Design a protein around this ligand. Structure first.
Ligand SMILES: *C(=O)[C@@H](NC(=O)/C(=N\OC)c1csc(N)n1)[C@@H]1N[C@H](C(=O)O)[C@H](CS)CS1
Length: 262
């Protein structure tokens, strides 16, 4: 629609920030892009890549997901809703992926990064997927700084949508891993107010939210509307003021504007 671009434009200005958007309609492989080629701080939406990178590995390491991992009281960071229940205990990689994807647990992310060899190797996995834009550079919690102009821990809407389609729908992962990722994302607890709040209440959403400094509010989602082919929707939104508040409603409006007619 001619209007869509102009609507996202006004949405962006009224919202007073920088709005990145990339929608893939698997019905006709069409796309809606808005600043789809600019870098945005990923924030916790980065957690999908790390877990996917662990999933990839398990394909070539029968278990891997069952390996236990020590939760040291030293490990705790700023947001630890599941790990904190296992200090001086362990959690499987399967349990950390789940905890990272569905509760945005920051310790589990750090564990995931650990077991794939640091952020550079998670980036190396993105390259094995043909994603040339994704870069993980830091650990939790500092990778969420979202300091403007910084390129650390960023990607583009276009890159992340194609990648997320490859992971949840395509063949980046074996059939069993693909299904596990989708179950995990389908079970997220943090997304109710972001992409999902812009869709009909009946559609099924698997999403990973992200938030960070400068009012940065992100969400990346695979969507299965009833009686339709799925959509991949990346919405990234960032703000000038370092202490600007989150704006999850911006992401819902964006999802609102790009699905009108679907
Ligand atoms: C990841 O992007 C996730 N949050 C964090 O990583 C947090 N801090 O790291 C800098 C954090 C602070 S409070 C909190 N709940 N998380 C994003 N935060 C949102 C949110 O609504 O706060 C959800 C967690 S409910 C996941 S996204």
């Amino acid at each position: 629609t001619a209007d869509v671009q102009q609507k996202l434009a006004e949405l962006e200005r009224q919202s007073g920030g920088r709005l990145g958007v990339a929608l893939i309609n698997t019905a006709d492989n069409s796309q809606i892009l808005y600043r789809a080629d600019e870098r945005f701080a990923m924030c916790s939406t980065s957690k999908v890549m790390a877990a996917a990178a662990v999933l990839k590995k398990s394909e070539s390491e029968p278990n891997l997901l069952n390996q236990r991992v020590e939760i040291k009281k030293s490990d705790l960071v700023n947001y630890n809703p599941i790990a904190e229940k296992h200090v001086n205990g362990t959690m499987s990689l399967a349990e950390l992926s789940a905890a990272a994807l569905q509760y945005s647990d920051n310790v589990a992310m750090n564990k995931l990064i650990a077991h794939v060899g640091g952020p550079a190797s998670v980036t190396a996995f993105a390259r094995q997927l043909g994603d040339e834009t994704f870069r993980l550079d830091r650990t939790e919690p500092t990778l969420n700084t979202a300091i403007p102009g910084d390129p650390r821990d960023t990607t583009s809407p276009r890159a992340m949508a194609q990648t997320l389609r490859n992971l949840t729908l395509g063949k980046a992962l074996g059939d069993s891993q693909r299904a596990q990722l989708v179950t995990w994302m389908k079970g997220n607890t943090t997304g109710a107010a972001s992409i999902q709040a812009g869709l009909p209440a009946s559609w099924v959403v698997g999403d990973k939210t992200g938030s960070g400094g400068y009012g940065t509010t992100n969400d990346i989602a695979v969507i299965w509307p009833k009686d339709r082919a799925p959509l991949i929707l990346v919405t990234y939104f960032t703000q000038p003021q370092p202490k600007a508040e989150s704006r999850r409603d911006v992401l819902a409006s964006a999802a609102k504007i790009v699905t009108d007619g679907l």
